[PDB]
Amino acid sequence: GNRRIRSVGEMAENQFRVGLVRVERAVKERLSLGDLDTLMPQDMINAKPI
């Protein structure tokens, strides 16, 4: 009852989450200096990190 069972789905959920925190620093970081209408939600969020 104190022993819980994980499995692939849960593990991947955690891993994808980690991608989102390390892209988060970037998103805030860019939104730090950003020009108004030039950037879009692409130039910020990367692929390799997530």
Binding site: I5, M11, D37, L39, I45, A47, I50
Partner: protein
């Protein structure tokens, strides 16, 4: 969705550009039999007990 709130609001946005489906990552897919193909080789993720 990127929203920018007017500086010294009442909070309202100058412009919000909605970036259509920005691509982040490729997440792996599970076979009909529950294995994954990582590099051309069938792999299982063992459930963990904690």
């Amino acid at each position: 969705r990127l929203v920018i709130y007017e500086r010294e609001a009442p909070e309202g946005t100058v412009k919000d550009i909605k970036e259509q489906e920005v691509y982040m990552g490729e997440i792996p897919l599970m076979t009909d039999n529950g294995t994954f193909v990582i590099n051309g080789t069938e792999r299982v993720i063992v459930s963990q007990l904690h």
